[PDB]
Amino acid sequence: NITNLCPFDEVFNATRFASVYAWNRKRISNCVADYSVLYNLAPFFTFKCYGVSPTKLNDLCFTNVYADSFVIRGDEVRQIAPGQTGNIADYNYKLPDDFTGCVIAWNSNKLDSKVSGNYNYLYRLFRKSNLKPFERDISTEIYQAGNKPCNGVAGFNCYFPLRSYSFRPTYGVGHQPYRVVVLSFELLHAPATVCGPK
């Protein structure tokens, strides 16, 4: 007898994805995790699991599952991986180096590109230090690039830290929007609630 399915349809099949600087975390617990939504693969091509096998997903059982969702470019999907360096990995979304979980990415060009430019998707370009793993920095404090204290205003050597993406459909792949879901598998020495179907 099957039980209540895990709400992955409100993660993958949403209509609003987040910016990468303000990525949305969803906690998933106390359901059966059917990972056979992979049958959407013809748009959903990228699927890369670290620390766990893709086929032995239902073999293991977990306490909590975190789904992290955002939009990046096509050329930045390689940065959503353990031990990567870039603009996204350092200031927007950092994975742990001992990351157990999967990264699911898919092209969203016919859903997130406007002919006048989709300026709704943001990313952090400047930050004083690299992010810790699973840290979320959403501050709009003026970045001090020089030696003057910048007085809370943007000018010479004092920049606004968040930049946009401006997605247009005639872009090449690598500048086209990609919706990314990162599944994070926890084992918190608790009753392991999230299990695959038996």
Partner: protein, 595 residues
């Protein structure tokens, strides 16, 4: 923080905002050139004004990074590209005065027309009609009129404008810490900073004059062959020992000699290779021509065209409802957008134009991973030299029967390769003395070595001495004979047409060794050879980030411009020309004038 780390942070902000505003300008420029509309004019003018207002502001902000305490040569290269003042070092009343002479010059050039002295109601513009007289007429006095009246009407109006144009452009370049405006033009080749790859601006003059001394044995044998063949079309007008009259060379200025092929053909009864009639029997269209072009580039290991290439390019004239500017262009809009605008007829010349514009896209695709100000050629002659070696391999009878356009039972003989190579040297060799002295005249006018009361005196003293071309009429200092050319009236550097011609055979001979080709260089096809494509791509990937002397070494193996690959290409022609010019005087006398 250090002033170099504040400059890396300033360029990270710039590269995000320059890439966004340049795409909007290029997409608005694409929409006008494909759909000519007044709304497409206002979209093109407003998107290009925002990009110029942005680039003016970021030029002011980049000057606060001194370019002295910055030691990374990559960061230094894009700051000095952005720190270029231009005409902003001049005063504001002289910056509008310089822009007034520049816009008046293109107006006098394009809207200047010449009326015949037979009927006052009929007149002739340059690009239709007066270009047709200089190309196809075989009457002496008919093209003597069209040559003289273009220079006695339009060249007279540009003489007092050009004397004011030189003075203000020299004030602009001396305030930018050059020597003159010819020194500013030579700064495209200046590579100061790198050990082992340096190049000074005065070194370009010495390297151009050194390579030209070896072209003169090949050129004066082509000049002696064309002159002996033009004594049959215009008898009692050509001297056997004199120069060539300037109105008989196939066009308005004697820039190219390609329209002299009807009179200077070696073996006229044998036809050229033209697979245009073989194209229509196999029902080729514009899509087939361009998919055979990108088939050629994947055979050497370069990428195929993108998905947005075939969806966004204009490869056909869209009919007489959609009006487009029908000039073959390769477009690099940024952000992965590569388009080719072309109105492709099913012809052999559009088949080689398809390989030309796709060689520009493949080079735009290679340096796409550079910073925004390093996404160009290594210098101004690099980008056209790559597109020219693709048309060079595609037109060979080896390549033209491997795709099935020639017959399999086709035999090429020596009476057709001379017909091919002489048609090349009328276009390629015949333009190099014109290109060299027109820049050497301009380099000395800006340097002040020619005073303005002796401009046409030394214009024709150098046209006789270097090109071997004589004036048909006397000319005083009321004429301005250089400014009758487009590039002199429209303020364009002209030495890029000289250096591209030497880079082209330097590029072609290097990829010919890598493809291991049997015999003559003009039979080389670099197709099906990934060693020739991987040696090219190591230069194409750098863009503008390295020295051009280092990018030249990544293909050729030498650090400088070399003319020996060019003379190796025309070596079966030079042998046949030396045997033909045995009963004729090889050389010209600058004292002989036809008047």
């Amino acid at each position: 923080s250090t002033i170099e780390e504040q400059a890396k942070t300033f360029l990270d902000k710039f590269n995000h905002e320059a890439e966004d505003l340049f795409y909007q300008s290029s997409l608005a420029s694409w929409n006008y050139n494909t759909n000519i509309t007044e709304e497409n004019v206002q979209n093109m003018n407003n998107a290009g004004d925002k990009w110029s207002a942005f680039l003016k502001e970021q030029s002011t902000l980049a000057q606060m990074y001194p370019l002295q305490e910055i030691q990374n040569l990559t960061v230094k290269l894009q700051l000095q590209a952005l720190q270029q003042n231009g005409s902003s070092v001049l005063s504001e009343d002289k910056s509008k005065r310089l822009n007034t002479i520049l816009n008046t010059m293109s107006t006098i050039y394009s809207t200047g027309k010449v009326c015949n002295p037979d009927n006052p109601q009929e007149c002739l513009l340059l690009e239709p009609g007066l270009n047709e007289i200089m190309a196809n007429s075989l009457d002496y006095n008919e093209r003597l009129w069209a040559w003289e009246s273009w220079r006695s009407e339009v060249g007279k109006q540009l003489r007092p404008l050009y004397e004011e144009y030189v003075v203000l452009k020299n004030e602009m370049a001396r305030a930018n810490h050059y020597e003159d405006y010819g020194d500013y033009w030579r700064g495209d080749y200046e590579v100061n900073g790198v050990d082992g790859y340096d190049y000074s601006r005065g070194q370009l003059i010495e390297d151009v004059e050194h390579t030209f001394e070896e072209i003169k044995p090949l050129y004066e044998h082509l000049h002696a062959y064309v002159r002996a063949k033009l004594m049959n079309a215009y008898p009692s007008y050509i001297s056997p020992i004199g120069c060539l009259p300037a109105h008989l060379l196939g066009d308005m200025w004697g820039r190219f000699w390609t329209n002299l092929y009807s009179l200077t053909v070696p073996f006229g009864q044998k036809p050229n290779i033209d697979v245009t009639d073989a194209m229509v029997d196999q029902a080729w269209d514009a899509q087939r021509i361009f998919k055979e072009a990108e088939k050629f580039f994947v055979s050497v290991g370069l990428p195929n065209m993108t998905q947005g290439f075939w969806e966004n390019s204009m490869l056909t004239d869209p009919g007489n409802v959609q009006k487009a500017v029908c000039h073959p262009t390769a477009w690099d809009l940024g952000k992965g957008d590569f388009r080719i605008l072309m109105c492709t007829k099913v012809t052999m010349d559009d088949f080689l134009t398809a390989h030309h514009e796709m060689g520009h896209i493949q080079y735009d695709m290679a340096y796409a991973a550079q910073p925004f100000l390093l996404r160009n050629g290594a210098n101004e002659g690099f980008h056209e030299a790559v597109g020219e070696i693709m048309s060079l391999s595609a037109a060979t009878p080896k390549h033209l029967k491997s795709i099935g356009l020639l017959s399999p039972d086709f035999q090429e003989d020596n009476e057709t390769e001379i017909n091919f190579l002489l048609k090349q040297a009328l276009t390629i060799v015949g333009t190099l003395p014109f290109t060299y002295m027109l820049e050497k005249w301009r380099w000395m006018v800006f340097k002040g070595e020619i005073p303005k009361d002796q401009w046409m005196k030394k214009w024709w003293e150098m046209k006789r001495e270097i090109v071997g071309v004589v004036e048909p009429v006397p000319h005083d200092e009321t004429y301005c004979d250089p400014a009758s050319l487009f590039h002199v009236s429209n303020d364009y550097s002209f030495i890029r047409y000289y250096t591209r011609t030497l880079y082209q055979f330097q590029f072609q001979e290097a990829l010919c060794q890598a493809a291991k080709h049997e015999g003559p260089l003009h039979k080389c096809d670099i197709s099906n050879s990934t060693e020739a494509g991987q040696k090219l791509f190591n230069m194409l990937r750098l863009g503008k980030s390295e020295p051009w002397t280092l990018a030249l070494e990544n293909v050729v193996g030498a650090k400088n411009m070399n003319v020996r690959p060019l003379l190796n290409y025309f070596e079966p022609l030079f042998t046949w020309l030396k045997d033909q010019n045995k009963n004729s005087f090889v050389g010209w006398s600058t004292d002989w004038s036809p008047y």
